[PDB]
Each structure stands twice: as C-alpha cells, then as structure tokens.
C-alpha cells in the first residue's frame, strides 16, 4: 500500500515526463510543417 502508492506515483511522474516530451516534439513538428508548406507554395508559384 505505501509501496503501491509510491510506484503508482512514479509511473504517473514517468508518463507525465513522456507526455511533456511528446508535446514539445509535436510543437516543433507543427512549426516545421508550416515552414515546409510555405516553401512548397513559394517553389510552386
């Protein structure tokens, strides 16, 4: 119970960090997708 609580909390901390990293990487992807779409429009015009 004390040990279960502690291991449930550490799994939460872990997923929380993973989600944070995934979210950051996705915001970077968002920005680079937009920059490549603008270059594709410039190249095709």
């Amino acid at each position: 119970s004390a040990r279960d609580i502690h291991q449930l909390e550490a799994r939460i901390d872990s997923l929380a960090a993973r989600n944070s990293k995934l979210m950051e990487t996705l915001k970077e992807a968002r920005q680079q997708l937009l920059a490549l779409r603008e270059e594709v429009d410039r190249l095709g015009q």
């Binding site: 989600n19 996705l26 915001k27 992807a29 968002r30 779409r37 429009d41 095709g44």
Partner: protein, 31 residues
C-alpha cells in the same frame, strides 16, 4: 511544370493543412 505536378503540390499542402488543424486540436486537448 505540369498539371500533375501542380495537383501533387495541392494534394500535399491540403493534407498538411488537415494535419496542422489536427495537431492544434491535440495540443489544446492535452492542455
């Protein structure tokens, strides 16, 4: 420059726009 080339760039940009809107949704919902 060909019709098939223009159609390909339109398809790709349109898919990119659908993904940009979906990304924005994902990022706001995970807030």
């Amino acid at each position: 420059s060909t019709a098939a080339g223009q159609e390909r760039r339109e398809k790709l940009t349109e898919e990119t726009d659908d993904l940009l809107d979906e990304i924005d949704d994902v990022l706001e919902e995970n807030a």
